[PDB]
């Protein structure tokens with residue numbers, strides 16, 4: 001209908017429980033084209049102008065699994081206006097790995113910090129506002145068990161969209177990697193969508209074959225990117241894939257130190 005919201009998080013983060021509260025009996029079950037992966041969507045019960053596109057639970061957008069491919073293709077397309085990232089608050093650091101990839105898509109992320117009621121019993125506290133600040137995304141505490149925060153997070157995701165968010169606030173990595181990403185961006189120009197340019201730049205840096213075949217870049221474009229990779233790999237003395245994963249982990253680690261307590 002009007003605003004299209006992508007619902008995604010790790011498996012066992014409470015996505016289904018949240019999807020059900022939000023949509024009630026306005027659901028639609030189907031098929032992602034060509035594959036047997038279930039496509040589920042629904043209208044927001046309290047606001048039929050908002051549709052929710054549920055996406056398969058994944059730990060990462062990287063793998064060449066059907067589930068991750070579905071998520072990648074949907075989120076690199078133009079259908080979604082907002083990403084509503086369901087996060088398991090009792091397992092924050094591992095959940096944020098996908099989150100970082102989600103922000104890089106350029107579709108504005110809103111986090112539903114789910115399982116907020118489980119924290120206390122585990123002797124765990126989170127500073128929602130501090131977590132929100134360091135990720136550059138809105139964060140709203142939710143619980144599908146106690147049915148709290150649900151309307152609040154939906155409303156926030158609905159007002160944090162591609163049409164209302166001006167500048168992309170991606171996670172900032174080591175200068176040396178940013179220099180490489182920045183240089184790949186220079187080379188790319190119009191060859192990639194402006195919103196998801198950085199996502200494409202990181203993928204080409206990681207030497208993603210699917211993206212490489214998709215983009216069909218020129219001789220000169222492909223050559224410069226090769227030289228950027230080799231020189232940066234040399235600078236770090238690691239392969240590209242490992243540089244990126246280690247930058248994500250360092251960033252996420254910082255963030256969890258700032259926001260988590262015992």
Ligand SMILES: Nc1nc2c(ncn2[C@@H]2O[C@H](COP(=O)(O)OP(=O)(O)O)[C@@H](O)[C@H]2O)c(=O)[nH]1
Nearest residue numbers: 010011012013014015016017114115143144145
């Ligand atoms: N205590 C508590 N349990 C939850 C919450 N959200 C979901 N669950 C439970 O977590 C389990 C997994 O929920 P689910 O919606 O299937 O997560 P999903 O695998 O991402 O779809 C179920 O037993 C839910 O009842 C929550 O906020 N608090």
